[PDB]
Amino acid sequence: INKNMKLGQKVLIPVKQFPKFNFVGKLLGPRGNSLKRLQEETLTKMSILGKGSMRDKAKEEELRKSGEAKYFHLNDDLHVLIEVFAPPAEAYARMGHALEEIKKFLIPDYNDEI
Amino acid sequence: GAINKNMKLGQKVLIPVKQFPKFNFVGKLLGPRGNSLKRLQEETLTKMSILGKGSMRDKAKEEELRKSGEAKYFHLNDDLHVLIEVFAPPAEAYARMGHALEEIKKFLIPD
RNA sequence: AUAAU
């Protein structure tokens, strides 16, 4: 119950469902640091990964073709990888709180009628 | 996954019987009629199962089921533990688990 | 023999 443990969770960014919405720009923010704040606030690490995550389509296709394990993620769908390293109770709580906080960044059409 | 679909999480928590061989962790977890562990589950919105060597009321029977090699009893070859399970959308599933893991700590200190 | 599942 006391030792640091690692957890990781992929969250799909629904680009197919909402192709007109710029999820990456919305995640990173107007100055590009919104995701940095979100991480520091939640005590997690968050990385935007998958097809489209590099904002350089030539380079992305190059790294994917290399077969280096660092870039395996580029085979995947666009997503945020949330990672945490803390004792079990804190690790799960942090993840729960990060997953909650990230929801607003990923739903263009949230309900606003009752 | 998508942020909305129900997901399953499971976490084993070791009961430190080796460290504290004199202490009845199982009785402490269950309480009278199992209502301690039942309450703890209901409060945390988790499922909890006590599993592993030492889990069963009955040491003769335990050894029998272990020897059967039925897969439902494989756990009896493992160390004593609580398996905490949850099924809910990702943010709620992780929160529940974090809260269960916090609440269970006091039961895994002897006195 | 705190004994749930």
Side-chain angles (χ1 to χ4, degrees):
Chain A
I1 198 72
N2 305 310
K3 187 64 187 75
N4 291 329
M5 76 167 302
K6 174 58 168 49
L7 295 170
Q9 180 69 55
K10 290 169 42 158
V11 184
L12 301 183
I13 299 158
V15 300
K16 291 275 163 282
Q17 284 81 36
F18 304 103
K20 286 162 163 195
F21 186 99
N22 175 15
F23 287 102
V24 175
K26 169 87 148 146
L27 278 159
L28 292 174
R31 312 195 307 265
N33 72 317
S34 292
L35 194 78
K36 192 183 204 264
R37 296 294 170 79
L38 178 52
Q39 281 169 94
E40 292 155 329
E41 288 159 17
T42 57
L43 304 174
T44 62
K45 183 177 186 185
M46 300 180 166
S47 308
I48 303 174
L49 301 179
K51 201 158 305 210
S53 57
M54 291 190 165
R55 303 200 75 242
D56 185 353
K57 272 54 245 134
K59 181 200 164 165
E60 218 179 86
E61 189 52 320
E62 222 285 349
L63 296 171
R64 197 192 292 142
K65 266 65 178 144
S66 82
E68 297 175 17
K70 168 191 299 310
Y71 302 121
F72 287 167
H73 76 83
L74 292 174
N75 291 310
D76 284 30
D77 293 326
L78 184 66
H79 63 277
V80 184
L81 178 68
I82 303 178
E83 295 177 289
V84 68
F85 184 69
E90 185 58 25
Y92 282 91
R94 285 179 192 186
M95 185 75 66
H97 175 218
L99 288 165
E100 174 68 1
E101 293 303 301
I102 208 163
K103 280 192 76 154
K104 69 188 164 290
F105 293 89
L106 305 179
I107 311 188
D109 69 336
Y110 56 81
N111 194 30
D112 50 60
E113 289 191 50
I114 213 82
Chain B
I3 198 73
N4 306 306
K5 187 64 187 75
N6 291 338
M7 76 166 303
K8 174 58 168 49
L9 296 169
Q11 180 68 57
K12 291 169 42 159
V13 182
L14 301 183
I15 298 159
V17 299
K18 292 275 164 282
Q19 182 169 23
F20 304 103
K22 286 164 43 86
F23 189 81
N24 176 19
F25 287 101
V26 175
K28 167 92 141 149
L29 277 158
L30 292 173
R33 310 188 59 94
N35 308 332
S36 284
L37 195 76
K38 284 183 203 264
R39 296 292 201 276
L40 179 50
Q41 283 168 100
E42 293 157 37
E43 178 180 291
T44 58
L45 303 173
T46 60
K47 182 178 186 185
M48 300 182 168
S49 308
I50 305 172
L51 302 177
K53 202 156 305 210
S55 55
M56 294 186 167
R57 235 289 141 251
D58 186 341
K59 292 323 170 302
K61 180 49 164 164
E62 214 185 97
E63 188 50 29
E64 223 196 32
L65 297 171
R66 196 190 63 68
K67 268 159 177 144
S68 82
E70 299 271 320
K72 71 188 175 309
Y73 302 121
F74 287 167
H75 72 272
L76 291 174
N77 292 310
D78 209 352
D79 296 309
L80 186 64
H81 63 278
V82 185
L83 176 69
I84 303 178
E85 295 177 289
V86 68
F87 184 70
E92 185 58 27
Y94 282 91
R96 285 180 192 185
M97 186 76 67
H99 175 216
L101 287 166
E102 175 60 356
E103 292 305 297
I104 208 162
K105 280 188 207 155
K106 70 188 164 290
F107 293 88
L108 303 181
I109 107 280
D111 258 27

